[PDB]
């Protein structure tokens, strides 16, 4: 399949969906759905990629993609300035919120009452800067009243980082220390748990997904780690 149907208690008046590697027209490096534009891939492929995927989610305008620059920033989709962002949000029908990656965390999120979503980008960088709690304080509504889906990231056997990734995580939050495990002189990280650390800590502990690896599953997932040059997927949510 072109894509994953996040596996949460999604609200009737939400649409979600997250893009795998499979189904597409590009060739190695980038087999087959690549949607990213700007990773050295065949433009006419990728835009081919495109229209397949955005037929497939039965998306009902083209994403909102955003300049992602691994920061912490949020643009919500007022209708820009700028999109040098690494979330959006949104509370405006069949507006389309989305996240590129190829290994970075993408976080969905929207109300249990289906009048507001989001979309973050949180590669450690900007996880361990605040992009999650930046992106949850966008939401008008209640905080046990977010749901959050950890879409397909780096899992935590492939996610070996050097010690100065464990500091700076634990220097926001000494819970931190938990979502690493020794290796040599690195760890491996686990991102998810990160996450869901940060997001608590705002007090959002509806929490989905979490259980894909773009590194290990490589049939099905492109993998910045594991290959360098390669595609992209994306995650998408937006109010019908």
Known sequence: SKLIVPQWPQPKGVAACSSTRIGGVSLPPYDSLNLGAHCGDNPDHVEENRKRLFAAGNLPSKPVWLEQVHGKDVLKLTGYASKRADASYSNTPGTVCAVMTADCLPVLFCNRAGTEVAAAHAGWRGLCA????????????????????????????????????????????????????????????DIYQLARQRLANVGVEQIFGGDRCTYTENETFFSYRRDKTTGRMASFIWLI
């Open 130 to 189: 605040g992009v999650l709690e930046e992106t949850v304080s966008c939401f008008a509504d209640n905080p046990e009243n977010i749901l959050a889906w950890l879409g397909p990231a780096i899992g935590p056997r492939a996610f070996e980082v050097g010690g100065e990734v464990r500091e700076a995580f634990m220097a926001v939050d000494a819970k931190a220390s938990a979502a690493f495990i020794q290796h040599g002189d690195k760890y491996l990280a």
